[PDB]
Design a binder for this molecule. Structure first.
Ligand SMILES: Nc1nc2c(ncn2[C@@H]2O[C@@H]3COP(=O)(O)O[C@H]4[C@@H](O)[C@H](n5cnc6c(=O)[nH]c(N)nc65)O[C@@H]4COP(=O)(O)O[C@H]3[C@H]2O)c(=O)[nH]1
Ligand SMILES: Nc1nc2c(ncn2[C@@H]2O[C@@H]3COP(=O)(O)O[C@H]4[C@@H](O)[C@H](n5cnc6c(=O)[nH]c(N)nc65)O[C@@H]4COP(=O)(O)O[C@H]3[C@H]2O)c(=O)[nH]1
Ligand SMILES: [Cl-]
Ligand SMILES: [Mg+2]
Ligand SMILES: [Mg+2]
Ligand SMILES: [Mg+2]
Ligand SMILES: [Mg+2]
Lengths: 261, 260
């Protein structure tokens, strides 16, 4: 009942272009350089103010609205990176990643939507990177397998988001074309004081090395977490310590100050 | 007018027609037999030695698996106790028993282990339980309670068929599984097949990262044994070393190694 209207309103937000993207710097931990940014959607509701994804993403995942919204995110994100490139603000090494739902494999619609967004923005494919939950391994059909290959063949990097909090098939993990793992922030938050979460993080790092995958740690909140991750060979990180998610202009501000150095 | 497999299986229990074979588990570094996996068979008067694949799946559909696993637990524990008592089992010998996920309904597993240890007098320490990897997809309070209970007793637990199912990293770090068993389907293909080899390499790295022991199942060749030994895989099981053996033939294996 109250859920149906949550969906309806979200649909109207797509209708009226009331979504906005913020971007969180992804950082090379050794050098401090911003080398990437995660696109994160927000809903500027003219009634409720800025509404956060955890309030609407999971419901949209259920009703199938996640697809239309994710088409919008893909387009806006590609356009924005291309705009920054054309304006001389993004260095050549900068990418942006977008969160994808498993609902997007249905009828191979993912491939088509990535292609439309790249074609319309004129963004280079390897500038875009996609992030999906581990749980995609639970729904591994020929259909899903086909999209993974399509994206590899385009150079669009795929990463596993929230790694450690889902279910992985160890055989699939070893076979499929994922290029990166993101250590979930719930483990990062607890290092180095908690053994269980600490050894989870070091195992992930060891898995990634053997699998030829890059690792991004999410949710770095302290100097201590930063130093441990770096000292142990975690390449990249994302967290409020360095920068919260930023509006476009403020993200691009960080780009500008980095170029000056 | 043949009897249903179900009737004939009830009758096998009633007439003591089931039997256990034991496959040695070997410490790769030294080649010493340090355990053995109990594997059930049906010595069926109409057919001879019938493998678990021809009745265990049927018993799982009907709930007769419960009664049947109770038999197995008890026979397995009884047997290790006999060998200990005859002086033939070393202090370090354990035996493992495959447990179906079905045995968790109503916390039956806890009771069935208590009863089998109480009947045989076997120290809980000497018994290991193997549960298929996919127990992690049905991980309820109920299941988490049997496992914590069993670990507290001192019963070792291992994840069987590993790599053919699904795992949560956070569970593996939190659940009381001391070890995992790399599935036979991956091992018999290494290193010739690069895909199954990568799967084994990944699994080894997973286990090492989490401080879990590894049994490689299905070692068929010397090259496979050296591949695993060199990569720190601690334990192995497979036809290269020894096929499943009847109790007496197993007992002779222990006698031979004891005579060093
Ligand atoms: N406490 C703390 N949090 C930090 C820190 N650093 C980053 N985060 C937060 O972690 C979330 C980013 O990771 P996510 O796993 O993709 O998690 C995302 C993602 O699963 C989903 N989501 C967001 N945008 C999209 C989207 O455009 N499409 C889809 N399908 N899902 C999205 O919503 C989730 C939550 O998004 P946000 O609320 O923006 O929350 C963001 C971000 O603000 C830190 O140091 N401390
Ligand atoms: N190709 C190959 N195979 C090898 C090798 N070494 C051992 N094996 C086989 O692998 C099976 C034992 O591993 P499992 O994954 O527990 O697989 C078991 C287990 O899941 C189930 N099972 C066996 N005994 C019991 C039992 O007492 N209770 C329950 N619930 N299930 C059982 O039936 C499955 C099949 O058992 P078995 O037919 O005895 O088949 C045995 C054994 O004969 C090798 O070098 N190469
Ligand atoms: Cl004793
Ligand atoms: Mg993400
Ligand atoms: Mg995440
Ligand atoms: Mg087994
Ligand atoms: Mg197995």
């Amino acid at each position: 009942h109250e859920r149906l209207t949550l969906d309806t309103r979200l649909r109207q937000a797509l209708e009226r272009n009331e979504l906005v993207l913020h971007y969180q710097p992804i950082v090379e931990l050794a050098s401090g350089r911003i080398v990437g940014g995660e696109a994160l959607v927000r809903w500027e509701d003219p009634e409720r103010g800025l509404v956060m994804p955890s309030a609407f993403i999971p419901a949209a995942e259920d009703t199938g609205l996640i697809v239309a919204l994710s088409d919008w995110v893909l387009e806006a994100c590609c356009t924005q990176l291309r705009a920054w490139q054309q304006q001389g603000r993004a260095a050549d090494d900068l990418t942006l990643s977008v969160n994808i739902s498993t609902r997007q494999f249905e009828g191979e619609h993912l491939t088509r939507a990535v292609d439309r967004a790249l074609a319309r923005s004129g963004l280079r494919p390897d500038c875009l990177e996609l992030e999906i939950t581990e749980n995609v391994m639970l729904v591994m059909t020929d259909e899903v397998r086909t999209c993974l290959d399509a994206l590899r063949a385009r150079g669009v990097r795929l990463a596993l988001d929230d790694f450690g909090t889902g279910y992985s098939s160890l055989s699939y993990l070893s076979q499929l074309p994922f290029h990166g793992l993101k250590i979930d922030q719930s483990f990062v938050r607890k290092i180095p004081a908690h053994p269980s979460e600490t050894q989870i993080v070091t195992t992930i790092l060891a898995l990634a090395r053997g699998l030829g995958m890059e690792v991004v740690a999410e949710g770095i909140e302290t100097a201590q977490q930063y130093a441990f991750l770096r000292d142990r060979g975690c390449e990249f990180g994302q967290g409020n310590l360095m920068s919260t998610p930023q509006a476009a202009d403020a993200f691009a501000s960080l780009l500008d100050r980095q170029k000056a150095s």
